[PDB]
Design a protein around this ligand. Structure first.
Ligand SMILES: [Cl-]
Ligand SMILES: [Cl-]
Length: 162
């Protein structure tokens, strides 16, 4: 298992514009297009992202390309973040993937907001971090995905994904 496989399980793959769990226009493997309610504004972002007139539909290759860019961006965002970097550097490979997943889902700012959990992860207090991570809108809104990520932080294994 690796970060790509992990995120592919959590996000799924859809080749036509769809609405994410928050009601936002998305496509591919969890690629947010816009927070605007307009489908036209989403098709326009889509065409710009892909470099062609897509009419709201993309191919598997195009989906995978956006995905590669997005994972790369998440990692680079973590490495540039004064709050996230130190946590990422302190973790083992498996748990680093857990942190990337959260950043991919809610963005760098959002995760940097989990101040107390970040501190607990850095201190390697797995059980305690797991409890604190669950006290969040994230956990209440997407509980199955949150549990998978949280178990990954708790155990340092890919068990929730196998
Ligand atoms: Cl883009
Ligand atoms: Cl869920």
């Amino acid at each position: 298992m690796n970060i790509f496989e992990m995120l592919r399980i959590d996000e799924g793959l859809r080749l036509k514009i769809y609405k994410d769990t928050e009601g936002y226009y998305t496509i591919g493997i969890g690629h947010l297009l816009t927070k605007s309610p307009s489908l036209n504004a989403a098709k326009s972002e889509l065409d710009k992202a892909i470099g062609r007139n897509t009419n709201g539909v993309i191919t598997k290759d195009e989906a995978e390309k956006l995905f590669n860019q997005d994972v790369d961006a998440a990692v680079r965002g973590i490495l540039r973040n004064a709050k996230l970097k130190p946590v990422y550097d302190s973790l083992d490979a498996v748990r680093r993937a857990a942190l990337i997943n959260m950043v991919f889902q809610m963005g760098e700012t959002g995760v940097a907001g989990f101040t107390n959990s970040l501190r607990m992860l850095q201190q390697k207090r797995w059980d305690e971090a797991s409890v604190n991570l669950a006290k969040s809108r994230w956990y209440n809104q997407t509980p199955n995905r949150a549990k998978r990520v949280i178990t990954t932080f708790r155990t340092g294994t890919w068990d929730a994904y196998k």
